[PDB]
Structure 1
Amino acid sequence: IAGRIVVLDPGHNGANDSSINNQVPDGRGGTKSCQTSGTATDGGYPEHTFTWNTVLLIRQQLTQLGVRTAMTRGDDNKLGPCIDKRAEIENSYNPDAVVSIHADGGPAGGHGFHVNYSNPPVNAVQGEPTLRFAKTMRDSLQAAGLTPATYIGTGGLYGRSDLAGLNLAQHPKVLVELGNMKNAQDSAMMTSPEGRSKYAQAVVQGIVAYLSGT
């Protein structure tokens, strides 16, 4: 584990302007918006702040394990990089694994996590190395006591073709939607410092299990 390289992507920006509506190539024949604002709890806790703070806790834990780390943005209050640039930044580190952190907006009764991965793969590394990452992450999150999303995906997994950050990956990568910000239970956990710590520890368990060959 020590000496491996992991890049962490806290989804969305600290702030936005109309540049986020410019279209960028999506890695699968199309284009999509440079960025989106992301969602928020009904209490007003923004997705971009949840992902930022959770990624900071993941980074701190990985560094203590001897893992070399980088992030795709440096703050939670200004314009951040477009989704295609974030994939380029991740790729430039030649990482062993990449984890993108998001939180979702779904029906209010729906809760739990889902692990998004590229499907069908557009290159070799998006095949078995990435599907294994997705399954291992899902297993680790569930073994940590988190609930697979009750409202989307299949047992906490979601293979998809529409995400530029996944299509553009040159290294094993998953995008973890940790929960539904519009749900009472997930909102409480996301808004809780110790809830963010528990999310972060479970993600780290998934990273360790994947890099260890579990």
Structure 2
Amino acid sequence: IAGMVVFIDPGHNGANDASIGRQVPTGRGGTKNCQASGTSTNSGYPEHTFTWETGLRLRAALNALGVRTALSRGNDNALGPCVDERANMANALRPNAIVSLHADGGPASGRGFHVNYSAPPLNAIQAGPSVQFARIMRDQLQASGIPKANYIGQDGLYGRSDLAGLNLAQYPSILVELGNMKNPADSALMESAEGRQKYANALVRGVAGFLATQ
């Protein structure tokens, strides 16, 4: 899998202003907000820092495997690109795999991951390789000890039509919600360097697993 191209997207920006309410295409004919601030744990640990820090670990491990990588953003302290631009950046790289990282803000009772993929598919890639990617990633996250969400999606998977990053993708692309920041157990993982590394190692498996099918 050495030499393959992976686009990594740590969801959200390190900082925001009024410009995130700017309307950008959804990829399905409508518009949505350029960005969203994202959620956080009860103690104030932000989604945007979690995805940034976890993405860095993911990036490092893939780099060590000889995999080519690029980030949707390069910091956690300034404005980042809108959600359509992050898809366009990826498309320009014609990647073998695209992975977006997020963390949920759901009912405290719920915990665990779910993998989002574009549905119904807008192209052959979204209909095939991306679904295969989502399934492989789900199995690898599970085999690594990350529990599947029991409160959202079904069986750790979720067909979405509302995500611009997924809708606009022309290359294998999934968006992983790693867990629920509002859940005490999930947040304990997220707020820890050790937990973020576990998340990252699991992600590497899912990515490497899918890249190996190319």
Do the two structures share a fold, i.e. TM-score over 0.5? yes
Q: Paired residue for 2:146?
A: 146
Q: Separation in 1 of the partners of 2:150 and 2:77?
A: 32
1:89 and 1:128 map into 2 onto residues whose CA distance is 22
- Paired amino acid for 1:114: H
Q: Which amino acid in the other structure matches residue 104 of structure 1?
A: D
Q: Distance in 2 between matches of 1:47 and 1:31?
A: 23
- Report the equivalent of 1:6: 6
Q: Distance in 2 between matches of 1:56 and 1:25?
A: 28
Question: CA shift at 1:208, angstroms?
Answer: 0.6
Say yes or no: does 1:31 pair with 2:31. Answer: yes
RMSD, aligned α-carbons: 0.8
- Structure 2's unaligned 5+ residue stretches are none
Q: Which residue of 2 aligns with 1:110?
A: 110
State the partner residue of 2:204: 204
Q: Name the CA distance, whole Å, in 2 between partners of 1:85 and 1:152.
A: 27
Q: Distance in 2 between matches of 1:100 and 1:160?
A: 14
- Counterpart residue identity of residue 82, structure 2: C
Equivalent in the alignment of 1:156 = 156
Aligned counterparts of 2:208 and 2:198: Cα–Cα separation in 1: 15
| 1:18 match | 18
Paired residues, number? 214
> Residue 134 of structure 1: CA displacement?
0.4
Which whole-Å CA distance do the structure 2 matches of 1:65 and 1:40 have between them?
A: 32
How much does 1:150 deviate? 1.3
Map 1:113-132 onto structure 2 (within 5 A): 113-132=113-132
Corresponding residue of 2:56: 56
**Structure 1 residue 92: deviation in Å?**
1.0
Number of the residue aligned with 1:134: 134
When normalised by structure 2's length, the TM-score is 0.99
- Runs of 4+ aligned structure 1 residues displaced above 3 Å come to none
Q: Tell me how far apart the structure 1 counterparts of residues 118 and 94 of structure 2 sit (CA, whole Å).
A: 19
Query: Which AA in structure 1 matches 2:146?
Result: L
Task: Flag structure 1 segments of 5+ consecutive residues without an equivalent.
Answer: none
- Structure 2 distance, partners of 1:173, 1:160, is 12
Give the drift of 1:65: 0.2
